[PDB]
Design a protein around this nucleic acid. Structure first.
Length: 270
DNA sequence: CGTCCAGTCTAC
DNA sequence: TAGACCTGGACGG
C-alpha cells in the first residue's frame, strides 16, 4: 500500500469505530517481532490520521475509564501487505498481528492490523518517522517547498523514477504512483531528477505527486469500501493507465524495483 | 511439484 | 549494493 491506501485505512478506522467503544488490552500475535502495546482501559475510543505512507492510531480512554490512563498514540507502516479490518471477535483473519476488542454491549468485534508478509511495523511513540518528508496528500505546499529547497541533495542526482520513491521528499509515493505520475507528463523515467525539477522551481510533476494520489482516494475502496474485493480490484485496474498495462515497457531501477512507462526510457537507463 | 512475482531495513 | 525480511497466488512441467 501507498499514500492513498494509508489515507483510506485511516478513514476506515474513523468511520467504523465512530460508534464503537473498545475495552481491555491491545493483543499482539505470538509471531509478530513488533513491540507489545502496554495499554489497558475499560472504555476507549480509537481514531486515526494518515501522513504519507504512515498511519497514526489514537487510543482515548473515556471519562471515568479504569485503570487511569492518558491517551496512547501508535504509528504504523504497512510494508507490502498491511491493512486494517473490523471483524467478529471469533473470526480473526490468519495474519491479525495486532487486535483491539470492543467492549459490551453489542456484537463483540476486533479491529485488527492484518499483515500477511509482516513487513509492516509499529512503534510505541506516537511520532512520525524522523526524516520522512511532508505528506503529498495533506501537506502539499510543505511537500513542494521541501523538494525545491533541497535540489542540491545527492538524492536528485538519481533517475527521477528512483527519486520519486525516496520517502524523505515524496512521502506516500510508491511503485504504482511513480509509474502513473511520470506517464501523465510523458517524462522518461531515467531522466535525471534535478533536470526535471530545476525546470519548475499543464500541471507539473510536483502538482501530480499530489493530484494523482488524490484521485485514488476519491475512487475509494482498496479494501476499505463496502463493495466486494472483486469490484474494488476492478475499479482500480480501470483507473490505472500505465502500471502493469498491455503496450507498456518496464525496466528494473538500481534497487531491482519495476518501473512501467511508454516510450523513451531516458538517458540514465540500464 | 517448481520458479517467479508482488517497502523498507541493515550488514557489508 | 545485496541480501534479508515473509506469504501466497499465478503460472509452468
Amino acid at each position: 500500500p501507498e499514500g492513498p491506501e494509508l489515507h483510506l485505512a485511516s478513514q476506515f478506522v474513523n468511520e467504523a469505530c465512530r460508534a464503537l467503544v473498545f475495552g481491555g488490552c491491545v493483543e499482539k500475535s505470538s509471531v509478530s517481532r513488533n513491540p507489545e502495546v502496554p495499554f489497558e482501559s475499560s472504555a476507549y475510543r480509537i481514531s486515526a490520521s494518515a501522513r504519507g505512507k504512515e498511519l497514526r492510531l489514537i487510543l482515548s480512554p473515556l471519562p471515568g475509564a479504569q485503570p487511569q490512563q492518558e491517551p496512547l498514540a501508535l504509528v504504523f507502516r504497512f510494508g507490502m501487505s498491511g491493512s486494517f479490518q473490523l471483524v467478529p471477535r471469533e473470526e480473526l483473519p490468519r495474519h491479525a498481528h495486532l487486535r483491539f476488542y470492543t467492549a459490551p454491549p453489542g456484537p463483540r468485534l476486533a479491529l485488527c492490523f492484518v499483515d500477511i508478509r509482516r513487513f509492516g511495523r509499529w512503534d510505541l511513540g506516537g511520532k512520525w518517522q524522523p526524516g520522512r518528508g511532508p505528506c503529498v496528500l495533506q501537506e502539499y505546499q510543505q511537500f513542494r517547498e521541501n523538494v525545491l529547497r533541497n535540489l542540491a541533495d545527492k538524492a536528485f542526482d538519481r533517475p527521477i523514477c528512483e527519486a520519486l520513491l525516496d520517502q524523505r521528499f515524496f512521502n506516500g509515493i510508491g511503485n504504482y504512483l511513480r509509474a502513473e505520475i511520470l506517464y501523465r507528463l510523458k517524462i522518461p523515467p531515467f531522466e535525471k531528477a534535478r533536470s526535471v525539477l530545476e525546470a519548475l522551481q499543464n500541471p507539473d510533476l510536483l502538482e501530480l505527486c499530489h493530484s494523482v494520489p488524490k484521485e485514488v482516494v476519491q475512487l475509494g475502496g482498496r479494501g476499505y469500501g463496502s463493495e466486494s474485493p472483486e469490484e474494488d480490484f476492478a475499479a482500480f485496474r480501470a483507473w490505472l493507465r500505465c502500471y502493469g498495462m498491455p503496450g507498456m515497457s518496464s525496466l528494473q531501477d538500481r534497487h531491482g524495483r519495476t518501473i512501467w512507462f511508454q516510450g523513451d526510457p531516458g538517458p540514465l537507463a540500464p
